[PDB]
């Protein structure tokens, strides 16, 4: 089954006519599908953008095109007066957002890459939790059986851009023997949480 | 907007400098594919996608032509203002904790990119390095700027220091971000 796409609506001019210096005129079109609880809740928002100014949008919860700034009314009026265009776009939630979610369900939403977890001294203990997907993760430090509440700092979740994430979680401790410090990592890919212990 | 998942089917970009365009699909903030608009081909970003999924690259070419038209129309009815140059924000980090002698990947994140015209290169001990370099497409942000990530596969180190070098019109001079 092929993937589908959201169509950028054509502006109605003009002719017109058409468009060296470091300047740039930028146009964006973003066809956005928002899913919650499988596909029990789906919302489509298409966004038309000049430089950084979103000037018109179609939101499936509204059901007509809407001008967002004073650059938009001519576009939104024109799109909403074209019965076939507006019908096309009202149907896109089904014909595109839901269509393509079925393909995600077979690939992307099955992707479960387990984290590599290591503990290293520091430059203080750093639990590095690397190369995982998807994003949901919980990393905790423990001293013997007690969750450390305190002296723990974490990076935000770091997106690597290659369909993996990492996170680093650091512990400040005053060691006395024979304390065992352990890093505990929970992730949806794991059959059991990963527990790594530090020595001495 | 609060959702379990968000997809961009797709992220369409056209600009007058070049001119150039970009077409890509994203899912929860990562890029599924881009379409190479001059070669007319879909380039998937994971093996699994390459094996099981299919996108007609003519779709992208159809759309981008529409953005080029739309850009003319908006310029026609407005005072035709060019993009403002943002100051991009640069971070360099590794894919995993670096040990000398063990292969790794430096990652350079260039964020708050607007307009989406940038150069990102790597330097080793001050000289240009092109083996092991690759980069993402421009990745969308919900303020309608972009980010982009460059990767350098390498064998650390003993005595090798790395810089990510970024050129953008929002900067006065090239910005060199030194790695840890």
């Amino acid at each position: 089954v092929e993937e589908l796409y959201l169509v950028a609506g054509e502006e109605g001019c003009g002719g017109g006519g058409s468009l060296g210096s470091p300047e740039d005129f930028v146009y964006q079109f973003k066809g956005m599908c928002y899913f919650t609880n499988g596909t029990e809740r789906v919302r489509l928002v298409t966004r038309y953008i000049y430089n950084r100014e979103e000037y018109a949008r179609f939101d499936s919860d509204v059901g007509v095109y809407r001008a967002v700034t004073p650059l938009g009314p001519p576009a939104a009026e024109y799109w909403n007066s074209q019965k076939e265009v507006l019908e096309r776009t009202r149907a896109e939630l089904d014909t595109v957002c839901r269509h393509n979610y079925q393909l995600e369900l077979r690939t992307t939403l099955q992707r479960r890459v387990e984290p590599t977890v290591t503990i290293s001294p520091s430059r203080l203990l750093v639990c590095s939790v690397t190369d995982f997907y998807p994003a949901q993760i919980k990393v905790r430090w423990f001293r013997n059986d007690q969750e450390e509440t305190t002296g723990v700092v974490s990076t935000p979740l770091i997106r690597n851009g290659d369909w993996t994430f990492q996170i680093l979680v650091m512990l400040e401790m005053t060691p006395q023997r024979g304390d065992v410090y352990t890093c505990h990592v929970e992730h949806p890919s794991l059959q059991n949480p990963i527990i790594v212990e530090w020595r001495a | 907007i609060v959702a379990d998942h968000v997809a961009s089917y797709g992220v369409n970009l056209y600009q007058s400098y070049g001119p150039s365009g970009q077409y890509s699909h994203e899912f929860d903030g990562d890029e599924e594919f881009y379409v190479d608009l001059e070669r007319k081909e879909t380039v998937w970003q994971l093996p699994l996608f390459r094996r099981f999924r299919r996108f007609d690259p003519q779709f992208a070419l159809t759309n981008i032509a529409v953005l080029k038209h739309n850009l003319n129309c908006v310029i026609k009815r407005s005072n035709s203002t060019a993009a403002t140059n943002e100051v991009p924000e640069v971070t360099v980090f590794s894919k995993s904790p670096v040990t000398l002698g063990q292969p790794n990947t430096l990652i350079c994140l260039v964020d708050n990119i607007f307009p989406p015209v940038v150069n990102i290169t790597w330097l080793s001990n001050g000289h240009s390095v092109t083996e092991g370099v690759s980069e993402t497409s421009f990745l969308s942000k919900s303020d309608h700027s972009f980010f982009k990530i460059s990767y350098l596969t390498f064998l650390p180190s003993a005595d090798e220091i790395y810089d990510c070098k970024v050129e953008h019109w929002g900067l006065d001079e090239p910005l060199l971000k030194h790695w840890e």
Epitope: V7, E10, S18, E84, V85, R88 | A65, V66
Partner: T-cell receptor, first 109, second 105 residues
Framework: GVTQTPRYLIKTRGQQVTLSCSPI?????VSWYQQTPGQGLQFLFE???????NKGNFPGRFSGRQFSNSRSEMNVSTLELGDSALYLC?????????FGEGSWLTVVE | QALSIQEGENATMNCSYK?????LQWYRQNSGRGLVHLIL?????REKHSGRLRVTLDTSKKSSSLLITASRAADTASYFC?????????????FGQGTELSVKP
């Protein structure tokens, strides 16, 4: 409706021919199709804003253009007997496409 | 393919298609003229009707049917089904081979 001219053409092998199409007003996509009993309806090319936007599988001696007002011409050079067909122009604004009446070309020996 | 029926009977035509689609549309042609659109159905619909026509769409078998009620001599024509092949815009449609319908007096 869309209008096409000329309606009827006779040519010999090796000549060239030009067909014109005026789309419905406010339609920016203009496409051309070739209809033949042997092969049915075959897509030649589509123009949008002056430029060719999609192309079918005909060789480069079939070519086209589009003017600022959206009107289109197509051209067939080094004509062959097999080029004899109904040439249809169509215009679109949305999903439905509106066809002209067609140009009938007979290439004779 | 070909269909022959009497004025006043119903005519049913069928086509199939090969790719993912957003919409399907049936067209009619008389000899030496343009195709004329009849009725459009989107891939999220099973049935749609208009005037004397009804189109059905089965997205799993990838087929469509066109029903013409109380057929007249004027319905004599070739009928073609065209899909968007997922483009959902522009002037390129993929047309099937067609059914010739003859309505007899």
């Amino acid at each position: 409706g869309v209008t096409q001219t000329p309606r009827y053409l006779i040519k010999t092998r090796g000549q060239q021919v030009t067909l014109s199409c005026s789309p419905i007003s406010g339609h920016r996509s203009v496409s051309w199709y070739q209809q033949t009993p042997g092969q049915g309806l075959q897509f030649l090319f589509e123009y949008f804003s002056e430029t060719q936007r999609n192309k079918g599988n005909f060789p480069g001696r079939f070519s086209g253009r589009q003017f600022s007002n959206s009107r289109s011409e197509m051209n067939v050079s080094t004509l062959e007997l097999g080029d004899s067909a109904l040439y249809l122009c169509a215009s679109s604004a949305g999903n439905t496409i509106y066809f002209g009446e067609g140009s009938w070309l007979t290439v004779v020996e | 393919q070909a269909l022959s029926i009497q004025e006043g009977e119903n005519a049913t035509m069928n086509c199939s298609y090969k790719t993912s689609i957003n919409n399907l549309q049936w067209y009619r042609q008389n000899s030496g003229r343009g195709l004329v659109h009849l009725i459009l159905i989107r891939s999220n619909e099973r049935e749609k009707h208009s005037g004397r026509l009804r189109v059905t769409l089965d997205t799993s078998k990838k087929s469509s049917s066109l029903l013409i009620t109380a057929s007249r001599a004027a319905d004599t024509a070739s009928y073609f089904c065209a899909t968007d092949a997922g483009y959902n815009q522009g002037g390129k449609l993929i047309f099937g081979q067609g059914t010739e319908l003859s309505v007899k007096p």
